[PDB]
Amino acid sequence: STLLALDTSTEACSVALLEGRALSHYEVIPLHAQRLLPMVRDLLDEAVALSAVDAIAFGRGPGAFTGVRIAIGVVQGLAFALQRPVLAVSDLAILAQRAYREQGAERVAAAIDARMDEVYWGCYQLQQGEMRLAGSEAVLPPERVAVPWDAADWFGAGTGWGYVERMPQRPVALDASLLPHAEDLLSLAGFAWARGEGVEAEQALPVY
Amino acid sequence: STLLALDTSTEACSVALLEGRALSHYEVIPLHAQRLLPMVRDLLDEAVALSAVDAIAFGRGPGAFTGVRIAIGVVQGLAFALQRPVLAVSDLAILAQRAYREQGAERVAAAIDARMDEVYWGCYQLQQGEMRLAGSEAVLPPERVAVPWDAADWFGAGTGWGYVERMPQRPVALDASLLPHAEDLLSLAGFAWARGEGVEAEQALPVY
Amino acid sequence: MSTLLALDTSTEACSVALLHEGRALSHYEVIPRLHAQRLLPMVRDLLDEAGVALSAVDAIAFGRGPGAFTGVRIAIGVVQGLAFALQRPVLAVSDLAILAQRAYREQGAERVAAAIDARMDEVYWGCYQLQQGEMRLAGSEAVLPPERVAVPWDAADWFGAGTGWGYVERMPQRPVALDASLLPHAEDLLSLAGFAWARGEGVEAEQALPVYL
Amino acid sequence: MSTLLALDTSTEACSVALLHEGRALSHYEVILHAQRLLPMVRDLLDEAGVALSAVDAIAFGRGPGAFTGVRIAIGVVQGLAFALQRPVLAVSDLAILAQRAYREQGAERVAAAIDARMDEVYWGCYQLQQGEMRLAGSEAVLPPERVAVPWDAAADWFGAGTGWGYVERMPQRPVALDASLLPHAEDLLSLAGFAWARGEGVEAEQALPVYL
Amino acid sequence: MSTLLALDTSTEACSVALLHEGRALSHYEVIPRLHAQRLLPMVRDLLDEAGVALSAVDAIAFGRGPGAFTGVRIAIGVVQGLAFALQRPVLAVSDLAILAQRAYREQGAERVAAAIDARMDEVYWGCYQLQQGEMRLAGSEAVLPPERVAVPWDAADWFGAGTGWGYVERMPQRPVALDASLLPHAEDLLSLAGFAWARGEGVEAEQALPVYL
Amino acid sequence: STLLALDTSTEACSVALLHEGRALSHYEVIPLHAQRLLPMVRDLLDEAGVALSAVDAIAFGRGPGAFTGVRIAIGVVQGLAFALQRPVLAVSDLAILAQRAYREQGAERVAAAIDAMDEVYWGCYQLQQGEMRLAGSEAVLPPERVAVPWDWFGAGTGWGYVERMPQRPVALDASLLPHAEDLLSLAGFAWARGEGVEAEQALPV
Ligand code: NA
Ligand code: NA
Ligand code: NA
To answer: After which residues is chain F broken (C to N over 2.5 A)?
Structure first.
């Protein structure tokens, strides 16, 4: 199947696509309503028809309030006119999958920086090929943050780890600069698409 | 020509369409990423094919920072997949055209409420069939606001007129509750489309 | 003529009111967040005392917020349920507006800056001005730190209404007069609902929704 | 042979234009210029298949107009010009309007007005002299009530620019006017042609905005 | 080895610096907003004094903001122009970071909360922590009223750097030590640019852009 | 260090001198600066028994304030310094107000304001070791938008537009203008820190 993947939930702007081949475009600059569409076009041509796309995946957040919503609106529009379904994926999960692909982390406590001196928090454990949510995602002060494993070896991924000193527990290793990447969204979309998780364009929405 | 018109720049959510017939759907509720797409579908069917649409018009703002951007992203997506051009129209202008259609105002000082104790300000004068910007749009404190006519009879339209008491001049009549309406955007789009003002989906952007 | 039901649970106050044959009746109690426990019993008691059947109700007004997240949503649910089952319209009205209209009933203020305490050290804020009996909004409603707050008037006498005014010392302007204990009251929601019902502003139960600021 | 590159971002218009081997090319888009100006410059040199090394002078709109927009153009021009070791040609945006209005409507006497901040207009009057719109008097920033032409009460003249949205507060008005004209780099380039011919070019460091 | 040019005009300070053959040279002047008037002459003088050709420059670093709206954008323009004409990459670096790295050079602080005065009674804010020679950002940068400001540390010694700290009395935390006069300095931009150039973070001139917060 | 200080920023015209650690000042309100400044310099110089060649540096109010008066004091200063081959010290008029209001009314913190068309010049200063130092940044703003960085005084012509500030102060002087003696004070601080520059670079805000 051919799948398209967009993410504008952070500073990062990223798009990716899966005939059987898989390609990725990733640019860090804070604007998203400007560079998104071009990145789409650049990728479709340097690889493929748009009406050939079977489903579109997106970061649903959490992240930037406006950022996530720009991607949603684009995806909402693209998918409606194409009449194809969409694939809602968490940005904390994408971070999880990224820290897997990049550093081989099988247990990832993902944390993205939030407003009002808080962090978005989500813990992910590798099951089969995929990072999968352990418990639930939350918006917490860094001092209230907690993991669902015993402390085992686990990894901290994302900007929320700037607040590590204020947290009650720290992993062996961590990357405070990781951001959701469209490649990883695409991996996660594979699992979701194969499980028939797609939904109609309207139901594409950000998380609360 | 067949034209589609969306606006989510304020509390108001509105969509409109022009074969030769003209229809409008208008709902006031603060959410926009939920009700927009449905309103599109409801209108296309209760009147017409989506791939028959020749151009799409939108409120470019000013207004709600996120609100305008949701409409943009939708329009950006719709238009790209359809491969049709778009029609950028100011929300202050739509207010102008609304106050014309509704109360017969040929000179309209449009004012939309803005952040940080300011108003978005734009003055419009009826030329031929259309309200047209007199000077330029700005973001001002209400005490610095000014009109480009002599004080003649002119109208105040929009939420910025809550601050009327703080302004240095007041019109004969005003409506502090007017909001941009997709019908009026569609009128304004007629003039813009007939003048060949359309642009490629990417260039669809909010005003600063 | 019109029979209207009004419910509010947006703050510490739980209140309900009924317009029937030009007469208005109200029950108002302050509890903290036992609202789910007490909102229906109150509707029941009010209808019972008035001798009015629920089927007689033409529209249900509710406080739409802002205020407590769970509080507001309890009102929303009950109202949704009632109006869907009856197949009647609902009227959404702001709690800041309700504050404004109450300050006008109790203290005679015609120019009110309604403020409600909010989470995370902000306050909800909306300024209202009397027009033909109805306190109508001037500008927009917002959630702001009390420092960034501002009125749309110039020399004008105005009133500070609501528990947001507990932050008055942290706020730029102080009004001539103020009341920081004041809560939305369903009797005043009923007045505002009347004006809205006259303009036919009612919606279907599915659209009985809280505001986001 | 003189090759001239021309940039303008003084108003909501963003335009570039090139003069090479007696040919004039130009792009124009109405929409944050810092994102757009340089890409436009690239696309243009490409479309004409010319290299930046060939360019002999860089012309720019020196204002009046948007405070930051003018400065974005001045900054790019300064930077291009310094690295390239080329001179720069400062041209008024009121003049460019006048030159555009002449090209587009044959007006030989143009009162250019650009809407300015704080309820004023930028005002300058121009008249054709050997194919170049030349300033008659001074440029000013004025309330529209205090605006005046240097000509006798209607030969006819023309009102050009967004300052003309204030026509009703002005003490006189022309027979014809276009309150929607904006500077266009094609006209900047015509004007640049004249200034280059009189050796008006200056060092990159001196590319600066005007204050009125 | 690498020859790098660094320009900053984001605040009242106009500065420029050059890395050439391991040696670093700088010019720094405080003027108010005559930047367009003085930025190129400064580049010229610096190159002249160093005896370095502009063609020798491998990359141009710039302060990307936050700071003055027009100030920042003047730097952007000049840099865009220079790098496009030369066909060399640019390196965008935060002015809060520059502040942080300067406080580390001058006062030896390893934990800095950089704050810059901003329009409309807010301040720009970003907290930085030394890592292998480089002050690296901890969390995110923001524009906040000085009341809502907060650090990502616990017991830890930290430094307040920049003119945002003119609002220290209105701010929740006060650090052990502070400097509210401190401005971004191009010498320190040059250090940060080095780390970025080592990781190959350079972009094309068309992407030399200011930040939005 | 012998320091000469000049101000014509506003309507008031003033000059001051620091010789042999003694500080002397002449102040005169006159709406005429291109006419009375140099006489004042010569008179003050006579009265101190000092020759202009003695002077090590020249301080001046760089603005903001009346555009004409500022531009003349700047010009005079540049001329004096070029010819004597002496460094110059640019000091804000808002800082000068804040230093005056300290010296005169005891104010440990001041919010200086000077009327400009509609807007007013704004700057807030705090005392730090006898010197009124700037808090945030100086700004030009409309009276309503004006903020504060915090028992605090309000100084300058711009405090005549007091209503809807939004904040009103403890006490205030709306007719307070810059004074050379307080420019002198501030200059001594600047001098001692090596803040001098070339005549070429004396310039307004
Ligand atoms: Na609160
Ligand atoms: Na104007
Ligand atoms: Na500030």
So the answer is: 31, 116, 150
The CA radius of gyration of chain A, in Å to the nearest whole number, is: 16
Q: Do chains C and D touch (3 or more CB pairs under 8 A)?
A: no
- Amino acid at position E90, single letter: V
E104: which 2 tokens?
């580390």
Nearest ligand, CA C118: 1
Is the CB of C147 less than 8 angstroms away from the CB of E148? Answer: no
Instruction: Give the three-state DSSP class for E209.
Output: coil
Contact yes or no for C154 and F166 at CB 8 A: no
Rounded to whole angstroms, what are the CA distances from C123 to C31, C109, C138?
A: 21, 21, 17
Q: What are phi and psi of C10, to 5 degrees?
A: -75, -20
Q: Tell me how far the alpha carbon of residue B96 is from its chain's centroid.
A: 9
CB B137 within 8 Å of CB B119: no
Query: Which positions ≥6 away from C85 have C-beta within 8 Å?
Result: none
Give residue C120 CA to ligand 1 midpoint distance, Å.
6
Report the residue from A37, A73, A82 with minimal CB separation from B74: A73
Q: What DSSP state is assigned to residue F197?
A: B
Domains and CATH numbers, chain F: 1-92+178-205 (3.30.420.40), 93-177 (3.30.420.40)
Give kind and range of the element (H or E) at residue B133: strand B130-133
Q: How far is E123 from chain C (nearest CA, A)?
A: 14
Interface touch D79/E76, C-beta < 8 Å: no
Burial class, C79, CB count within 10 angstroms (exposed 0-12 / middle 13-18 / buried 19+): buried
Tell me the backbone φ, ψ of residue C198, rounded to 5 degrees: -60, -45
Q: Which residue among D35, D79, D208 sits closest to E85, beta carbon to beta carbon?
A: D79
Spacing, Cα E77 to ligand 1 middle (Å)? 43
* Residues written for chain B: 208
SS percent in chain B: helix, strand, coil, step 5 = 35, 30, 35
Of E163, E199, E197, the closest CA to residue E178 belongs to E163
Please list, in sequence order, all residues whose beta carbon lies within 8 angstroms of the beta carbon of residue C92, skipping any fewer than 6 positions away: C61, C62, C64, C203, C208, C209
The CA distance from D49 to B23, in Å, is 49
Interface probe, candidates B86, B89, B133, B136, chain D, greatest D C-beta count within 10 A: B136
Shortest distance between the Cα of A161 and any Cα of chain E, in A, equals: 7
- Tokens encoding C201: 């502003």
From residue A116, give the alpha-carbon distance in Å to each of A176, D73, E145, E157, E168: 19, 38, 12, 23, 19
Q: Please, which experimental method was used?
A: X-ray
Please indicate whether chains C and F are in contact, defined as at least 3 beta carbon pairs under 8 Å: yes
Backbone angles phi, psi at E72, to 5 degrees: -55, -45
Q: How far, in whole angstroms, is CA A125 from its chain's centroid? A: 15
Residue in D closest to E80 by C-alpha: D76
**CB atoms near residue B152 (< 10 Å):** 11
Contact E75 D75 (CB under 8 A): yes
In angstroms, rounded to a whole number, what is the distance separating the alpha carbons of residues B108 and B175?
11
Q: Closest Cα of chain C to B136: distance in Å?
A: 22
> Exposed (0-12), middle (13-18) or buried (19+): which is B2, by Cβ within 10 Å?
middle
Sign of the dihedral through C-alpha A31, A33, A39, A42:
negative
How far apart are the CA of F162 and the centre of ligand 2, in A?
A: 26
Q: Which of F137, F149, F201 sits opposite E170 (nearest CB)?
A: F149
- F79 touches F66 (CB < 8 A): no
Closest-CA distance of chain F to residue C8, Å: 35
- Residue in chain F closest to E116 (alpha carbons) equals F136
- The two beta strands, A138-140 and A155-157, are unpaired
* Type of residue numbered D35: Q
